[PDB]
Design a binder for this molecule. Structure first.
Ligand code: CLA
Ligand code: CLA
Ligand code: CLA
Ligand code: CLA
Ligand SMILES: CC(=O)O[C@H]1CC(C)(C)C(=C=C/C(C)=C/C=C/C(C)=C/C=C/C=C(C)/C=C/C=C(\C)C(=O)C[C@@]23O[C@]2(C)C[C@@H](O)CC3(C)C)[C@](C)(O)C1
Ligand SMILES: CC(=O)O[C@H]1CC(C)(C)C(=C=C/C(C)=C/C=C/C(C)=C/C=C/C=C(C)/C=C/C=C(\C)C(=O)C[C@@]23O[C@]2(C)C[C@@H](O)CC3(C)C)[C@](C)(O)C1
Ligand SMILES: CC(=O)O[C@H]1CC(C)(C)C(=C=C/C(C)=C/C=C/C(C)=C/C=C/C=C(C)/C=C/C=C(\C)C(=O)C[C@@]23O[C@]2(C)C[C@@H](O)CC3(C)C)[C@](C)(O)C1
Ligand SMILES: CC(=O)O[C@H]1CC(C)(C)C(=C=C/C(C)=C/C=C/C(C)=C/C=C/C=C(C)/C=C/C=C(\C)C(=O)C[C@@]23O[C@]2(C)C[C@@H](O)CC3(C)C)[C@](C)(O)C1
Ligand SMILES: CC(=O)O[C@H]1CC(C)(C)C(=C=C/C(C)=C/C=C/C(C)=C/C=C/C=C(C)/C=C/C=C(\C)C(=O)C[C@@]23O[C@]2(C)C[C@@H](O)CC3(C)C)[C@](C)(O)C1
Ligand code: KC2
Ligand code: KC2
Ligand code: KC2
Lengths: 70, 176, 166, 193, 175, 193
C-alpha cells in the first residue's frame, strides 16, 4: 500500500464488509454480538470478511483511480 | 484468562506443556491449524532467521569466503546469483527438505505416535533438550525473526552500514 | 465503578483513589469536566479546520472570522472586548448554569452524580443498564478527547497546525 | 516505604514533611517508594554532576590523552558545558553502555524497591548471578568497605546527610547550568560556568 | 589495626594515622590498605634500586634491545625518564602487559582473596623461587616483614624525591 | 568426562574449576567429554605448531631438497607462514592424507570418548584391528614406550602438565597468527615472524 486515501478506502471497505456480512444468518448488522460471532465462527469470520473486504476495496479503488476521484 | 492478554481467555490447545507458551493466541489459530504443525513452522522460521541474521551481520562486517563477491548483504543475493555458485546452497536445502520435512510433515499430520514439531533428534554433542534449552531456543528464534524483519526492511530503506539507521549509533543512542 | 472497564479495569497506577476513596467523587467530577471541555475543544479544532464563519468579528477592528487561523494564533487575533465576552460567558455558564460543586471545593452533590449539572430539561435514560453504558462512553470519550486535545495543543504550539507532519 | 516509614525529615523544615502539594499524602505507598528511589537517584547524579562541573570550570584534567587522535585538554577546551560533544563518540558510547548495564542489573535484582524492597538501596554487587556472564566481585558501593566500621544508628544519620547533600546538589547543578545559559540568573558564578 | 604489622619504635608504639583513615576502615578495608601499601612499597623499592644502579655508574646490559630498530642499552641514556622515553613503545607495552597479567593472577588466582580473608601481599609465584626463606621461624619472618615495610617507606620517599628532582629543580638536597 | 572428575583444575585459578560462563553446567555429560577431547586436540596441535613456527622464524631448516628441484631453504625463504604455500601441493597432500587417516582411525575406535571412553586419550596403534589394512605396530603416542617407566600419580601430574602447556601453546600460536596479520598487535614478534 502507498497512499493514505487507498489505505483509508481499504480499511473502510473491510470494516463495512465485516459489519454487514452474515454467515448462516448471524452477523453484527443483524444484532449478533461480537463475542457470539467469535465463538461460533472463530477466525473464519475475519478471514472471509477481510478477503471480500479486499475484493470490494480493490474494486472501488480501481474504479476511483479510473474515474480520477482518487 | 491468558497471561499475555489479561482480557481474553487462552485457548484450550495451548495449555502449558509446550515450550515458549505464554498464552499468546488472541485469534485462535490453534483450533484451525494443528499445534504440532504450527510449532514445526515456528521453529523452522526461527532457525532460518537466526542463521539469516548471523550471516547477514557477518557478511556486512566483512567476513567473506574466498572467490565470492566483495559486496554487502543487501546486494549479496544478486551478486551470488550472477556469479553462479548459489544453486549449490539450494541443493542441500533441497535434500534436507525433501527427505526430512515432507516425511516429518506427513507424520505430524497423520501419525499419532510421531515426534513433536521441530524435533529432528539433532543432538550430536548431546548438549541437552531440556525445557530450558527449548525455551531459550524459542525465545532466541522469535527475537531473530523480528530482528531479521527489521534488518531487511531497514537496510533496504536506508542503504547504510551495520546499524541500518539513518544517523547511526546516534539513533540508538540520542545522547550522542 | 463507572470509568472502570475496558482494556484496563480499575487503573490507578499511583493509587490516588485507593489511598483517599473519599475523594473519588471529586476526581470523577474533575475528570468529567475536563473531558467535556476536551470534547468541545477537539470538535472546535475539527470544525474550524474546514468551516469558517462569514462576517466581521468586530466592526471597530479590521479582523474577519476568515483571517484567524485555527490555533493559538487564531485565539490571539481577537479583540480584548471579545475575549472578555468569551470569558464572562464561560463564567456565567460555569457558575450559575452548570456548577459542579454545590458549595466549595470537594463538595460535589451527594444526592446527584458528580457530573450532574444539567437542569430538569435534559435528555435522561430511564434504564440503569443504558444509563450506565452511556455514562461509560461519556467518560471514555472524555479521556480520549482530552489526550487528543493535549496532542492538538502541543502540535499547534510547536508547528502552528494541529495536524502534525505526515 | 510509607508516609513516615522513610527518613529525610530535617530541622530546616521543623522536622515536618515538606509537601505543599500533598503528593505524598495522596498517592499510595508504592508510589512513595518510587518517589524516594527517584529522589535519591537524582541527588546522587547531582552530587556527581555538580563536582564534575566545578572541576570543569576549574579546568583540571587528567594528564595525558583521552585517545590517540584527541587529548584530555582538547576535549575540555570549550569550557564545561561544551565537553560531552567534544568527547570521543566511542568513549561516551562505552560510558552509556556501562551505565545501561548497571541500571538494567539494578532493575533486574529480584527484591524490587517498589514490590517489596528497600527504596534507594540498589544492589551493591550488580552483574552477579546473571547466567552466562562473569564479572569481578567489585562492590559497586563502598568497594573498600567503609560500612563495616559504622553502626546502624550512624548509618541513619549518614543517610539523612546523603539526602540533604543530594537535594542541595540537585539545586546547585541546575543553578550552574542556568548560570551558564542565562548570564545573570544566579549570582556568585564566574564566567567559566 | 593494632594487630597489623609495620609499627616500630620510630613512631613510638602506636599507629601513625593523623587523619584517622584506619578508624573509618573495616577489617577488609585495612586489608586493602595494607595490600596497596605493600604493592607501592615493593614497586618503589625496585624502582629506586634500578634508578640508583643505572644512574650511579652501574654496568648497563650488553647487546641491542631492538636489533630491528637499532636501539641499544648504552644508546638509552643513563638518565631517569630519558631511558623510558627512548625505550620502544612495544617494549613498554610488553612490560605493562606482563605486570598486568601478574596482577590479574594475583587477583583471580589466589582463592583466599585479601579482601575476603586471606593475607595481603602474598604472591606465591614470584617470591623465593629457589627457596631462600623456607626454613625461618614465624616470628623471625614477622620481624622481616616489619623490616620490609620500614625499608620500603624510605624507598618510596626516595623515588618520589628522585622524580621531584628530575622535574622540579632544586626540590631535594644532595643533588 | 564429568567436570568434577577431570584433571583440568589447576593452581592457576585457585584449585577450582574455571568456567566463568555457564557452559559446563548447561551442557549435559557427553558434551563435556567432547569439549575435553577437543581441548586436548587443540592444545596438542598448537603445541606442535608453536614449535614449528618458532623453528621456521629462526630459519633452522633441513639440509637437502624437499623435491627434485625445490629446497627446504627455498620454501623457507618467504618466512615461517608462507612456507605452507611454498611447499609442493603434492607434499602437503600426503601430509593431509596421513592426518585424515589418523583422525578417522582415532574416531573409529569403539568405546568412543563420548560413549564411555577417556576423553583426550587417543588410542595407541590407531591402524590395528582394521580389516583390509596392515600397518607396523608403531604406537602413535610414545613409540619408544617412555610411559612404561612412569607411575600412575606421576602420569597424572604429567597429564596436568600437558594440559597447562597446551593451553599456553594455543595462546602462543594465536599470538603468532595475529602478530602476522595485524602488525604490532602482539609485541615480541620481530620482522622474522
Ligand atoms: C463505488 C465505487 C465504484 C466505482 C466508482 C466503480 C467504477 C467502475 N467499475 Mg466497478 N466495482 C465496484 C465499485 C465501483 N466501481 C465494486 C465494489 C466492485 C466489486 C469488486 C466492482 C467490480 C467491477 C468490475 C468487475 C468491473 C467494474 C467496472 C467498472 C467501470 C465500469 C462500470 C460500468 O458502467 O460497467 C459497464 C456497464 C454495463 C451494463 C456492462 C454489462 C456487462 C455484462 C457482462 C453484459 C467503472 C470505472 C468494469 C470495468 O471495465 O472497469 C474498468 C468492470 O469490469 N467494477
Ligand atoms: C548471533 C547472535 C546470538 C547468538 C549466537 C546467541 C546465542 C545465545 N543466546 Mg542470545 N541473544 C542475542 C544474540 C545471539 N544469542 C541478542 C542480540 C540478544 C538480545 C540482547 C540475545 C539475548 C539473549 C538472552 C537474554 C539470552 C540469550 C541466550 C542465549 C544462549 C541460549 C542457549 C544457552 O543457554 O547456551 C548455553 C550457554 C552458554 C554457552 C553461555 C553463554 C555464552 C555467551 C556469553 C552468549 C545462546 C548462547 C540465553 C542464555 O542462557 O544466555 C547465557 C539468554 O538468557 N540471548
Ligand atoms: C620497576 C622497576 C624498574 C623499571 C621501571 C626499570 C626500567 C628500565 N630499566 Mg631497569 N632495573 C631495575 C628496575 C627497573 N628498571 C633494577 C632493580 C635494576 C637493578 C638490577 C635495573 C637495572 C637496569 C639496567 C642495568 C638497565 C636498565 C634499563 C632499564 C630500561 C629498559 C628496560 C630494561 O631492560 O629493564 C630491565 C630490568 C630488569 C630485568 C629488572 C626489573 C625489576 C624487577 C623487580 C625484577 C628502563 C628505563 C636499561 C637502560 O636503559 O639503562 C640506561 C639498562 O641498561 N635497568
Ligand atoms: C578451544 C579450546 C578449548 C576448549 C575446547 C576448552 C574446554 C574446556 N576448558 Mg578450557 N581453556 C582453553 C581453551 C579451551 N578450553 C584455554 C586457551 C585456556 C587458557 C586460558 C583454558 C583454560 C582452562 C582452565 C583453567 C579450565 C578449563 C576448563 C575447561 C573445561 C570446562 C569449561 C567448559 O565448559 O569449556 C567449554 C569450552 C567451550 C565450549 C569453548 C568455547 C569457546 C568460545 C566460543 C570462544 C572463546 C574465544 C576466546 C576468548 C578468544 C581468545 C583469543 C572444558 C573441557 C576447566 C576444566 O577442565 O575443569 C575441569 C578448567 O579448570 N580451561
Ligand atoms: C442537551 C439536550 O437537550 O440534548 C443533548 C443531550 C446529550 C446527552 C448531551 C446529547 C449528546 C451528545 C453530544 C453533544 C456528544 C458530543 C460529543 C463530542 C463532541 C465528542 C468528541 C470527541 C472527541 C475525541 C474523542 C477526540 C479525539 C482526538 C484524537 C484521537 C486526536 O488525538 C486527534 C488526532 O489524532 C487525529 C484524529 C489525527 C492525527 O493526525 C493526530 C491528531 C492529534 C490531530 C444528545 C442526546 O445528543 C442531545
Ligand atoms: C488531596 C491532596 O493532598 O492532593 C490532591 C489534590 C491536588 C494537590 C489539588 C492535586 C492536584 C493538582 C495537580 C498536581 C495538577 C497538575 C497538573 C499538571 C501537571 C498539568 C500540566 C499541564 C501541561 C500542559 C497543558 C502542557 C502544554 C504544553 C504545550 C502546549 C507545549 O507545546 C509546550 C512546549 O514545550 C513544548 C512541549 C515544545 C516547545 O517546542 C514549545 C512549547 C514551549 C510551547 C491532586 C493531584 O489531585 C492531589
Ligand atoms: C633523591 C634524593 O636525594 O633524595 C633525598 C631525600 C631522601 C628521600 C631521604 C633520599 C632518598 C632515597 C631513599 C631514602 C632511598 C632508599 C632506598 C632503599 C632503602 C632501597 C632498598 C632496597 C632494597 C631491596 C631491593 C631489597 C630486596 C631484598 C629482598 C627481595 C630479599 O630477598 C631480602 C632477604 O634476602 C635477604 C637479604 C635475607 C633472606 O633471609 C631473605 C630476605 C627476603 C629477608 C636521599 C637520597 O637520601 C636524599
Ligand atoms: C610385451 C608385454 O609385456 O606387453 C604387455 C605390457 C603392457 C603394455 C604393460 C600391457 C598392459 C597394460 C595392462 C595389462 C594394464 C592393466 C591394468 C589394470 C589391471 C589395472 C587395474 C586397476 C585397478 C584399480 C584402479 C583398483 C583400485 C582399487 C582400490 C581403490 C582398492 O584398493 C579397493 C580396496 O578394497 C581393497 C581391494 C582392499 C581394502 O583393504 C582397501 C580398499 C577399500 C581401498 C599389456 C597389454 O599387458 C601388454
Ligand atoms: C612477554 C610477552 O608479551 O611475551 C609474548 C611473546 C611470547 C612469549 C613469544 C609469546 C608466546 C608464545 C608462547 C606462550 C608459546 C608457548 C609454547 C609452548 C607451551 C610449547 C610447548 C611445547 C611442548 C612440546 C613440544 C612437548 C613435547 C613433549 C614430548 C616429546 C614428551 O612427551 C616428553 C616426555 O616423553 C619424555 C621424553 C619422557 C617422559 O618421561 C616425559 C614426557 C612424556 C614429558 C606471547 C604469547 O606472544 C607473549
Ligand atoms: C460569548 C458569547 C457572546 C455573547 C453571549 C454576546 C452577547 C452580546 C450581546 C447580548 C447580550 C450584545 C448586545 C453584544 C454586543 C456586541 N458584541 Mg458580543 N457576545 C458574545 C461574544 C462576543 C465576541 C467574541 C465579540 C463580541 C463583540 C460584540 C460587539 C462589538 C462589535 C464591534 O466590534 O463592532 C458588540 C456591539 C465583539 C467585540 O467585542 O468587538 C470589539 C467580539 O469580538 N461578542 N454581544
Ligand atoms: C567508565 C567507563 C569506561 C569503561 C568501564 C571502560 C572500559 C574499558 C576496557 C575494559 C577493561 C577496555 C579494554 C577499554 C579500552 C579502551 N577505552 Mg574505555 N572505558 C570507559 C570509558 C572510556 C572513554 C571515555 C574512552 C575510552 C576509550 C578507550 C580506548 C581508546 C581507543 C582509541 O584510542 O581509539 C580503549 C582501547 C577512549 C576512546 O574510545 O577513544 C577513541 C575514550 O575516549 N573508554 N575501555
Ligand atoms: C619483563 C618483561 C619482558 C618479558 C617477560 C619479555 C619476554 C620475551 C620473550 C619470552 C621468552 C621473548 C621471546 C621476547 C622477545 C623479544 N622481546 Mg621481550 N620481554 C620483556 C620486555 C621487553 C622489552 C622492554 C623489549 C622486549 C623486546 C623484545 C624483542 C625485540 C623486538 C624487536 O626489536 O623488533 C624480542 C624479539 C624489545 C622490543 O620489542 O623492541 C622493539 C624491547 O624493547 N622485551 N621477549
Amino acid at each position: 500500500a502507498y497512499s493514505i486515501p487507498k489505505a483509508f478506502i481499504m480499511m473502510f471497505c473491510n470494516v463495512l464488509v465485516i459489519s454487514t456480512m452474515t454467515i448462516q444468518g448471524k452477523g453484527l448488522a443483524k444484532g449478533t454480538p461480537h463475542d457470539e460471532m467469535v465463538e461460533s465462527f472463530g477466525i473464519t469470520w475475519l478471514l472471509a470478511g477481510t478477503a471480500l473486504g479486499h475484493i470490494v476495496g480493490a474494486g472501488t479503488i480501481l474504479g476511483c483511480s479510473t474515474a480520477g476521484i482518487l | 484468562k491468558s497471561k499475555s492478554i489479561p482480557f481474553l481467555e487462552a485457548p484450550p490447545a495451548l495449555d502449558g506443556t509446550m515450550a515458549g507458551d505464554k498464552g499468546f493466541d488472541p485469534m485462535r489459530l490453534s483450533e484451525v491449524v494443528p499445534i504440532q504443525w504450527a510449532r514445526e513452522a515456528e521453529l523452522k522460521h526461527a532457525r532460518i532467521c537466526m542463521l539469516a541474521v548471523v550471516g547477514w551481520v557477518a557478511v556486512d562486517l566483512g567476513f567473506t569466503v574466498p572467490y565470492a563477491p566483495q559486496v554487502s548483504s543487501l546486494a549479496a543475493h544478486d551478486a551470488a546469483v550472477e556469479k553462479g555458485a548459489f544453486l549449490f546452497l539450494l541443493f542441500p536445502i533441497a535434500v534436507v527438505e525433501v527427505l526430512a520435512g515432507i516425511p516429518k510433515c506427513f507424520q505430524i499430520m497423520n501419525d499419532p505416535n510421531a515426534a513433536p514439531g521441530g524435533d529432528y533428534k539433532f543432538d550430536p554433542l548431546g548438549i541437552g533438550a531440556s525445557a530450558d534449552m527449548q525455551e531459550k531456543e524459542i525465545s532466541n528464534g522469535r527475537l531473530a525473526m523480528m530482528a531479521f524483519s527489521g534488518i531487511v526492511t531497514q537496510a533496504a530503506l536506508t542503504q547504510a552500514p551495520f546499524p541500518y539507521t539513518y544517523n547511526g549509533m546516534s539513533d540508538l543512542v540520542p545522547v550522542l | 465503578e463507572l470509568g472502570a472497564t475496558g482494556p484496563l479495569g480499575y487503573w490507578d497506577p499511583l493509587g490516588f483513589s485507593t489511598k483517599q476513596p473519599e475523594r473519588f467523587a471529586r476526581y470523577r467530577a474533575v475528570e468529567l469536566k475536563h473531558g467535556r471541555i476536551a470534547m468541545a475543544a477537539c470538535t472546535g479544532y475539527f470544525v474550524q479546520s474546514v468551516l469558517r464563519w462569514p462576517g466581521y468579528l468586530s466592526t471597530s477592528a479590521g479582523v474577519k472570522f476568515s483571517d484567524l487561523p485555527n490555533g493559538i494564533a487564531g485565539f490571539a487575533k481577537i479583540p480584548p472586548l471579545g475575549l472578555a465576552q468569551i470569558f464572562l460567558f464561560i463564567g456565567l455558564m460555569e457558575a450559575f448554569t452548570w456548577p459542579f460543586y454545590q458549595g466549595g471545593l470537594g463538595k460535589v452533590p451527594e444526592g446527584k452524580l458528580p457530573g450532574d449539572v444539567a437542569g430538569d430539561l435534559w435528555v435522561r435514560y430511564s434504564d440503569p443498564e443504558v444509563k450506565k453504558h452511556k455514562l461509560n462512553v461519556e467518560i471514555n470519550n472524555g479521556r480520549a478527547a482530552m489526550m487528543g486535545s493535549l496532542g492538538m495543543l502541543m502540535h499547534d504550539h510547536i508547528l502552528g497546525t494541529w495536524i502534525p507532519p505526515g | 516505604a510509607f508516609v513516615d516509614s522513610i527518613e529525610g525529615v530535617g530541622e530546616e523544615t521543623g522536622n515536618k514533611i515538606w509537601d505543599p502539594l500533598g503528593i505524598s499524602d495522596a498517592v499510595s505507598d508504592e508510589a512513595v517508594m518510587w518517589f524516594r528511589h527517584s529522589e535519591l537517584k537524582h541527588g546522587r547524579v547531582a552530587m556527581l554532576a555538580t563536582v564534575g562541573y566545578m572541576i570543569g570550570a576549574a579546568g583540571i584534567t587528567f594528564p595525558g590523552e583521552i585517545a590517540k587522535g584527541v587529548t584530555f585538554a582538547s576535549v575540555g577546551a570549550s569550557g564545561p558545558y561544551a565537553a560531552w560533544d567534544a568527547t570521543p563518540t566511542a568513549g561516551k558510547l562505552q560510558i552509556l553502555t556501562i551505565i545501561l548495564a548497571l541500571e538494567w542489573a539494578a532493575e533486574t535484582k529480584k527484591p524490587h524497591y517498589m514490590r517489596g524492597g528497600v527504596p534507594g538501596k540498589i544492589d551493591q554487587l550488580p552483574f552477579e548471578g546473571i547466567p552466562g556472564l562473569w564479572a569481578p566481585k567489585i562492590k559497586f558501593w563502598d568497594p573498600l568497605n567503609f560500612m563495616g566500621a559504622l553502626t546502624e544508628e550512624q548509618k541513619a544519620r549518614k543517610r539523612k546527610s546523603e539526602l540533604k547533600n543530594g537535594r542541595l546538589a540537585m539545586i546547585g547543578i541546575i543553578s550552574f547550568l542556568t548560570g551558564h545559559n542565562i548570564p545573570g540568573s544566579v549570582p556568585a558564578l564566574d564566567s567559566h560556568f | 589495626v593494632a594487630d597489623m604489622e609495620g609499627v616500630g619504635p620510630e613512631t613510638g608504639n602506636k599507629v601513625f594515622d593523623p587523619l584517622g583513615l584506619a578508624k573509618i576502615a573495616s577489617p577488609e578495608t585495612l586489608a586493602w590498605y595494607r595490600a596497596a601499601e605493600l604493592k607501592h612499597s615493593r614497586v618503589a623499592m625496585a624502582a629506586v634500586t634500578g634508578w640508583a644502579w643505572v644512574s650511579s655508574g652501574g654496568p648497563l646490559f650488553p647487546g641491542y634491545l631492538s636489533i630491528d630498530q637499532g636501539i641499544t642499552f648504552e644508546s638509552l641514556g643513563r638518565d631517569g625518564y630519558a631511558a623510558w622515553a627512548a625505550v620502544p613503545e612495544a617494549g613498554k607495552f610488553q612490560i605493562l602487559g606482563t605486570i598486568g597479567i601478574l596482577e590479574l593472577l594475583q587477583e583471580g588466582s589466589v582463592k583466599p582473596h585479601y579482601m575476603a580473608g586471606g593475607t595481603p601481599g602474598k604472591v606465591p609465584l614470584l617470591w623465593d623461587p629457589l627457596g631462600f626463606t623456607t626454613k625461618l621461624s614465624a616470628d623471625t619472618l614477622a620481624t622481616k616483614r616489619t623490616s620490609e615495610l620500614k625499608n620500603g617507606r624510605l624507598a618510596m620517599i626516595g623515588v618520589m624525591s628522585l622524580v621531584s628532582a628530575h622535574f622540579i629543580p632544586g626540590s631535594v638536597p644532595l643533588l
